[PDB]
Design a protein around this ligand. Structure first.
Ligand SMILES: C=C1C[C@]23C[C@@]1(O)CC[C@H]2[C@@]12C=C[C@H](O)[C@@](C)(C(=O)O1)[C@H]2[C@@H]3C(=O)O
Lengths: 334, 447
């Protein structure tokens, strides 16, 4: 009854359907109904014909692990006929062209890079930020637990960096931005942390409601317990299915600012943009992450939305959508 | 009409039924908190879901059950010398379209030269396409240029052994047919692509161990005239009848010879009254061959409508190859066949692999060189086929998740369950290499 007064009707319908389905696909033992999940998932296909100024195609970047990636680019201004394959990897033009490397969410279990929700999010990002977007299809859990996802992200980052038609005609270098939502925020944080010591330079991070957590219960969890399409019993299921057996929630993959982690002070970390939803369950953990980034000395901009829930960025029928998109566009093209 | 935002996300919910769906979700959530870890498991494993896109019907089923163009392209990151090859192929096709024959033979020789130094699937694709273009160039003024044929007997079985396209098609068709044969006393099956008959034994065996007793089984086969002038259908019927004596069920057979399917009639099949015996029609890679004849597919659809069956299974190839412009069709076929040839790289080397490759090469040669009624490789996509069927009086028969599970299980035995993935779309199934759909299976019924 309370959830119906803070979100529009159709977003409520979508999120409630997702929650009910994921309720019926979850089993107390620890197993997951993978076949039924793939049946219930809605997907789309690549289309090299430009629709609303965007066309896309798939690239198989690794065959030993079946690593896929979907590439989105704007329509060509000097080409009447539809693009083909020779022109797919056509060298980009312009002084500076941003490249966004995107990781989808789903608590390391749900969805896929080819899902319609993320194909639409990536198309909107291309349309508004006016840049190139590369979506990554990383391994899911519990079939493939920690750290399959960080390895997939690292390989995709290397492939994006090594391309030659993605470069710029101003400094002969690629402008790489890491982005993600939910579990994508975790993947982006760890990929940047492992990219700071390899040499590859990352321009920034865009975290859309990152999924972090710890061991002690916060006031947000006690008060918002299962009242805004997010319960505490299913958070523990997802954390148990991803982390290795015999490890609590103080593992560094769960709590970056844990005693068992390495300090971020004096470490090469890029500029960041953290977006926090006020009405979501795990709100204090995100604010604690932003506070720790600020205290460590790293640059960070915090965007706290006092009346936003999870999945506020899947439909354009609200006011948080435009604000977040404008902030992202100003963040990238600065 | 449907609301736009959910329609683009992937959910068909009308604008006037938003409150109803929200209330249904609220009702479903309420009785899920009272039910323990038993009910939810009973919905996870036992019951079968239909049309997940339609939220209203899906929620109704859960509630009542708990409380009784677009051209996809995939780029394999293994090519470093094929750019020149694709330039040469496109240039040769364009030169052909503009009456530049001598330039076309020059480029054909160049393609022959460059493909020698390459390796992998691209070399084979280039070789077969070069042969197809040479055959095309051999059709100017001399009226003495013959063609080839399609030995769908010793080659298609080898393709069956090599590849999962026929096994998946047979499995899905058998799953769909059995679901519509529940409760009926006598059944009758009409096959438009009898060929060797390697999908019927399994269906009969699965039907015999049913709760209620194996129904009477009658089968009628239609095939093209034999290449060696023999009686192949009689032999197939003899083996099938022999295999039907261990199931405690009656068996009948009938053979039919027809060059095409457009000359068939509902009176030649000797159909018994429908009230006493159901009829099922099956087609596997046999419907796109009638696209070249002007008015053959409409005739066949009218005959099927007159038969009045209970189900109609169709399996086809998912690609647009009927485009009027030669260049667009050439590019589409080039990419589709390149992706089909890249999926057979991990398979260990065997004679079956070579035979399937020869079959694909013959397909390419017929699709490119021949024009007019001689061209039988006229593939379409799901939207085109649905538009063709919808103007005849057929309705989509949404397949069930149980078939999804069985297809995935049967697909995990091939290459340790790698590459091939099943998807779902408007009550249909798709077998594809990663994110590239190659073959679709669908079932239809009278409206
Ligand atoms: C069980 C889950 C998991 C949700 C929250 C939810 O409570 C309901 C459904 C999931 C989800 C669906 C799509 C989006 O990726 C997500 C971030 C959301 O808003 O909602 C997804 C989100 C998540 O993956 O964290």
């Amino acid at each position: 009854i309370e959830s119906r007064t803070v979100v529009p009707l159709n977003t409520w319908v979508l999120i409630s359907n997702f929650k009910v389905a994921y309720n019926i696909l979850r089993r107390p033992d620890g197993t997951f109904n993978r076949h039924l999940a793939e049946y219930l998932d809605r997907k789309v296909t690549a289309n090299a014909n430009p629709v609303d100024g965007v066309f896309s195609f798939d690239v198989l970047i690794d065959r030993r692990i079946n690593l896929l990636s979907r590439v989105y680019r704007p329509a060509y201004a000097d080409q009447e006929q539809p693009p083909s394959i020779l022109d797919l990897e056509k060298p980009v033009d312009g002084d500076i062209v941003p490249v966004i490397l995107f990781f989808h969410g789903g608590s390391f279990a749900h969805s896929s890079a080819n899902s319609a929700i993320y194909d639409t999010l990536c198309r909107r990002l291309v349309g508004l930020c006016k840049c190139v977007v590369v979506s990554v299809n990383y391994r899911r859990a519990p079939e493939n637990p920690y750290p399959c996802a960080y390895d997939d992200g690292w390989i995709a980052l290397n492939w994006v960096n090594s391309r030659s038609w993605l470069k710029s005609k101003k400094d002969s270098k690629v402008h790489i931005f890491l982005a993600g939502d939910s579990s994508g925020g975790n993947i982006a944080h760890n990929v940047a942390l492992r990219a700071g010591e390899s040499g590859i330079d990352v321009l920034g991070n865009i975290l859309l409601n990152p999924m972090f957590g710890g061991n002690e219960r916060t006031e947000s969890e006690k008060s918002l317990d299962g009242k805004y399409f997010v319960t505490v019993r299913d958070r523990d299921w997802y954390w148990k299915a991803f982390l290795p057996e015999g490890e609590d929630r103080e593992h560094p993959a769960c709590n970056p600012f844990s005693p068992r982690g390495k300090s971020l002070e004096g470490v090469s970390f890029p500029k960041s943009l953290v977006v926090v939803a006020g009405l979501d369950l795990i709100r204090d953990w995100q604010l604690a992450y932003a506070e720790g980034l600020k205290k460590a000395g790293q640059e960070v901009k915090l965007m706290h939305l006092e009346k936003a829930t999870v999945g506020f960025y899947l439909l354009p029928n609200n006011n948080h959508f435009h604000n977040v998109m404008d902030e992202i566009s100003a963040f990238v093209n600065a | 009409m449907d609301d736009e935002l959910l329609a683009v996300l992937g959910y068909k919910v009308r604008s006037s039924e938003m409150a109803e769906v929200a209330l249904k979700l609220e009702q479903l959530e309420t009785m899920m908190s009272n039910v323990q870890e038993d009910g939810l498991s009973h919905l996870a494993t036992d019951t079968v879901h239909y049309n997940p896109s339609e939220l209203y019907s899906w929620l109704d089923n859960m509630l009542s059950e708990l409380n009784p163009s677009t051209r996809s392209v995939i780029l394999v990151d293994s090519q470093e010398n094929g750019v020149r090859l694709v330039h040469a192929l496109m240039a040769c096709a364009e030169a052909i379209q503009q009456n530049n024959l001598t330039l076309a033979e020059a480029l054909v020789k160049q393609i022959g030269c460059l493909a020698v130094s390459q390796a992998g699937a691209m070399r084979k694709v280039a070789t077969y396409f070069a042969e197809a273009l040479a055959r095309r160039i051999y059709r100017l003024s001399p009226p003495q240029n013959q063609i080839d044929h399609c030995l769908s007997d010793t080659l298609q079985m080898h393709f069956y052994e090599t590849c999962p396209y026929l096994k998946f098609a047979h499995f899905t068709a058998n799953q769909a047919i059995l679901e519509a044969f529940e409760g009926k006393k006598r059944v009758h099956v009409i096959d438009f692509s009898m060929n060797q008959g390697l999908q019927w034994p399994a269906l009969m065996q699965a039907l015999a161990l049913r709760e209620g007793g194996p129904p009477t089984f009658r089968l009628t086969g239609i095939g093209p005239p034999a290449p060696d002038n023999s009686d192949h259908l009689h032999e197939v019927g003899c083996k099938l009848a022999q295999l039907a004596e261990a199931i405690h069920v009656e068996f009948e057979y009938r053979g039919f010879v027809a060059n095409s399917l457009a000359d068939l009639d509902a009176s030649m099949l000797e159909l018994r009254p429908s009230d006493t015996e159901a009829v099922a029609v099956n087609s596997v890679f046999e419907l796109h061959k009638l696209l070249g004849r002007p008015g053959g597919i409409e005739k066949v659809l009218g005959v099927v409508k007159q038969i009045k069956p209970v189900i109609f299974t169709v399996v086809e190839q998912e690609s647009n190859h009927n485009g009027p412009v030669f260049l667009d069709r050439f590019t589409e076929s080039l990419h589709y066949y390149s992706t089909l040839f890249d999926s057979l790289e991990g398979v260990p080397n065997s004679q079956d692999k070579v035979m399937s490759e020869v079959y694909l090469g013959k397909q390419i040669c017929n699709l490119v060189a021949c024009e007019g009624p001689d061209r039988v490789e006229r593939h379409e996509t799901l939207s085109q086929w649905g538009n063709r069927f919808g103007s005849s009086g057929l309705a989509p028969a949404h397949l069930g998740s149980n078939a999804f599970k069985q297809a995935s299980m049967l697909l995990s035995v091939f290459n340790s369950g790698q590459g091939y993935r099943v998807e779902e779309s408007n009550g249909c199934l798709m077998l594809g290499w990663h994110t590239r759909p190659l073959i679709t299976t669908s079932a239809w019924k009278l409206s």
